Amino acid sequence: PHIKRPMNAFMVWAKDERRKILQAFPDMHNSNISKILGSRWKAMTNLEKQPYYEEQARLSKQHLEKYPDY
């Protein structure tokens, strides 16, 4: 949850978008929702990535803040 994984506003917005979609497609597993998210992402507006953007730097800030004696 608070690790420097290769995520981003997309995997950040898509993690809820896939969760928000999986609800609608509880069978659409990763191998499929993946094209959904990445297709829901490009289907966004770029300027609408304001929140999913800072939400990345935050979860990234919550990770390092967690490891002091780095």
Contact 13, 42 (CB under 8 A): no
H runs (alpha helix) in 23-49: 30-41
Strand runs (DSSP E) across 10-50, as ranges?
A: none
Phi-psi region of 10 (alpha: psi -120 to 50; beta: other; left: phi over 0): alpha
**Vertex 46: Cα angle to 37 and 39 (nearest 5):** 20
* Angle (nearest 5°) at CA 27 between 24 and 31: 110
Rounded-to-integer distance, Cα 22 and Cα 40, Å: 13
- Homologous superfamily assigned to 1-70: High mobility group box domain (1.10.30.10)
DSSP letter assigned to residue 68 = S
Enumerate the domain spans of the chain. Answer: 1-70
